[PDB]
RNA sequence: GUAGACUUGAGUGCAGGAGAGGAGAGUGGAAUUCCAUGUGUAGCGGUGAAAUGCGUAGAUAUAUGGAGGAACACCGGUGGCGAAAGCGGCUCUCUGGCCUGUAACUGACACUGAGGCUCGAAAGCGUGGGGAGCAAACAGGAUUAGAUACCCUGGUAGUCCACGCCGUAAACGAUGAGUGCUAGAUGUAGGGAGCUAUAAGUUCUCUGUAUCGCAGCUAACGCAAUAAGCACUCCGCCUGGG
């Protein structure tokens, strides 16, 4: 019932054709859980100019999805977030908690 | 000369992490936080900001370690 | 981030920049107090009336 | 706790007179109405009034002072503690302060005074002296 | 997972119990045919050739999927059975084609997980991906330097394995004890975990039940003859000061390592 | 320890008077609900002894509960033993 | 005691927030030490100084990447939470406990608390790991009459992780639990309400935790609204010293 938020980053040199897949298999994770939002706005670069985890600038990705209640579907994600090589950093928080 | 907590200035509640430096002038020049004494903060409302600054310091949107 | 350099600094001017600003760095108190390790009940002797003596 | 409003109340009177102030408080019973009744009749307070609709109605009572808010009541205490319902005889009910003190006892008739408790051969529970 | 026996009698004093407690019921499958074999250590030559040994049973072994070179199928686990042989347990599997394939079991699998590789699959427990597909810092086994050739290497009864890294042709992998080989990167691999863990601490009282285990007992070298052993026998249980005691064969044993650094190896190493 | 739908639902079924959200029967409802909806969390890792003390004060709230609904009231629980039927 | 009634105590409802509350599941950086490593020379160590020592097998130091454990400076505070013990990188999981309002509702369900039960510092003890830095044990060098000590060089147990136990700590504030009463100057939280309006900034209310001090108060010291003041119910201790 709650909007979540997931912020991951990918190295910038990849293409848009990579980016569509690399958001839509998280559409696949939210369609196997099913607890998906309207659309995870999962690309919003603000800007990077600092090395947390050894990159000065990649491509931000901000998911921010509604889902079901406090159940398996939320914490299901990160086990399938670690698997991608392209992740630099992800983040997962509720609306205000 | 008021300049306390910035809370009445960004009144209210937003965000407190999706700024870049609008909330994050709470930074020091050395990547750490402004003092709660020099800033002179309202304690748990400072906690209402800093409880997501500690995120937003080290969320790879901000240099958490710096000098000068 | 680090500019390391005051605006067209000289030798004694950068010396006063590092003395003044790097004295307000806090870069020395936690080190000299981190000469040795202490008991955590002594870490709240640190977190005691030294700071309350500073403010109040 | 709530289990002694009697000595809670008399102790509160010692707060009012020892703190030399106007009004003390008491929830609504009948027994406390007899307390301020009998002792007002013996000249120690100056009001008999309580909150008009409450089973915990605040019996707020102006006191009877000396000459400068001066005390009249000094050794105020409940005799029979809640751990001890004091059950004395009727025939040799003792004097208080060699006569200089009050006495109030729930006898078989009612809750009557010192010498009325003495020579009427009525006996009950000792409550309070001064 | 270890129960106890109640100390009723002597010999039954400690008797650290099993807690099998987990394994599917009984009766392993009959077309799991592997013929039984006891060399009893002794060889083609057949004098003894290999030390203290012997006394088990007709240990009817069975074909596990040593290689698992199969592909992207509903590879259904059905049962996890007891192994007489090896420390971890085991599991039945049917593919689409109706076969009776069969794998080493793990810690927390269950019937119907049907886990498989193409190497299509992701990192969940029971996939035979190669480390060219597997990412960094994972917990695998069944990696053998010959591709198309199953378990000879550190697919390990006991605990499973881990992987530090990889580069180019090979893979920077620990095994245990601070050891790293660098294995050919497109050789197969089974992400997961060993079947059993606590089967390192079971203490069992009877010498004869260790004969039911099947090793005839081991002599000390001490009271043995000068004919027998370099422990030169004589008066008493005398000490041995004879420069680092050793085998009844002819090499010192404590200390020295015997690497054979002149190998088909040693460019696949760690510091130790 | 439940949402408003099963909260007010269990008030709705297990209330013997409408709007009596402080009924002893609704004390049985929420409290005798989260005894077994407390056991899920003690079996969650078997470590949170503070929640075990929550079970202490809620077992004691059950103790005042049926110690009172047997204590002063008697027969509106004697007809209502089969709410859960302890002991 | 028996029957009876009401909420006006308690709790349960509906709204608020809050926190290092617990327990798991993970992630990030700085920093230490080490693997190679640029390329160069005796260095570094420590104090009042050095021997300790290491190091020319030429290195520290400086160039980088890797490895691993630990812990997470300003945040951090007479701050909060938790009965305390205690709890602070970050994110989730299910998780108590209050307070503000509220009579919506039970109609005294209250307070306790021997017994019994649970939790619980700090070490250590069991099994199995993990093994950076620190450091019992011990060694070497000063030290002096002497040094089994303070200093230095090290350096084992041990510190950390799952997994069981002791039940004893200045347990402290050497101040039991419940609730009632009340001069004020005073902190700070987070609500409730007003409040100050063309953005400002004030007043009341509750639990919090100080500091001074009315009364009261003690042998004095001091306590004093989170009473060492005035009451009552549950418990407990205490009888001159060894």
Swiss-Prot record, chain A:
Keywords: Ribonucleoprotein, Ribosomal protein, RNA-binding, rRNA-binding. SUPFAM superfamilies: Ribosomal protein S6 (SSF54995). The keyword Ribonucleoprotein applies. InterPro entries: Ribosomal_bS6 (IPR000529), Ribosomal_bS6_sf (IPR035980), Ribosomal_S6_plastid/chlpt (IPR020814), Transl_elong_EF1B/ribsomal_bS6 (IPR014717). It holds the Pfam family Ribosomal_S6. One of its GO terms (molecular function) is structural constituent of ribosome. The keyword rRNA-binding applies. GO terms for biological process: translation. CDD domains: bS6. GO terms for cellular component: cytoplasm; ribonucleoprotein complex; ribosome. NCBIfam families: S6. Binds together with bS18 to 16S ribosomal RNA. Belongs to the bacterial ribosomal protein bS6 family. This is Small ribosomal subunit protein bS6. It comes from Lactococcus lactis subsp. cremoris (strain MG1363).
Curated annotation (Swiss-Prot), chain B:
One of its GO terms (molecular function) is structural constituent of ribosome. This is Small ribosomal subunit protein bS18. It comes from the Bacteria. The gene is rpsR. Part of the 30S ribosomal subunit. Forms a tight heterodimer with protein bS6. Binds as a heterodimer with protein bS6 to the central domain of the 16S rRNA, where it helps stabilize the platform of the 30S subunit. One of its GO terms (cellular component) is cytosolic small ribosomal subunit. GO terms for biological process: translation. Keywords: Ribonucleoprotein, Ribosomal protein, RNA-binding, rRNA-binding. Belongs to the bacterial ribosomal protein bS18 family.
Swiss-Prot record, chain D:
InterPro entries: Ribosomal_uS8, Ribosomal_uS8_CS, Ribosomal_uS8_sf. GO terms for cellular component: ribonucleoprotein complex; ribosome. One of its GO terms (biological process) is translation. One of its GO terms (molecular function) is rRNA binding. Keywords: Ribonucleoprotein, Ribosomal protein, RNA-binding, rRNA-binding. Gene3D superfamilies: 3.30.1370.30, 3.30.1490.10. Pfam families: Ribosomal_S8 (PF00410). It comes from the Bacteria. One of the primary rRNA binding proteins, it binds directly to 16S rRNA central domain where it helps coordinate assembly of the platform of the 30S subunit. Part of the 30S ribosomal subunit. Contacts proteins S5 and S12. HAMAP family: Ribosomal_uS8_B. Belongs to the universal ribosomal protein uS8 family. This is Small ribosomal subunit protein uS8. It comes from Lactococcus lactis subsp. cremoris (strain MG1363).
UniProtKB/Swiss-Prot annotation, chain F:
One of the primary rRNA binding proteins, it binds directly to 16S rRNA where it helps nucleate assembly of the platform of the 30S subunit by binding and bridging several RNA helices of the 16S rRNA. Part of the 30S ribosomal subunit. Forms a bridge to the 50S subunit in the 70S ribosome, contacting the 23S rRNA. It comes from the Bacteria. GO terms for biological process: translation. This is Small ribosomal subunit protein uS15. Pfam families: Ribosomal_S15. CDD domains: Ribosomal_S15p_S13e. It comes from Lactococcus lactis subsp. cremoris (strain MG1363). GO terms for molecular function: rRNA binding; structural constituent of ribosome. Keywords: Ribonucleoprotein, Ribosomal protein, RNA-binding, rRNA-binding. Belongs to the universal ribosomal protein uS15 family. GO terms for cellular component: cytosolic small ribosomal subunit.
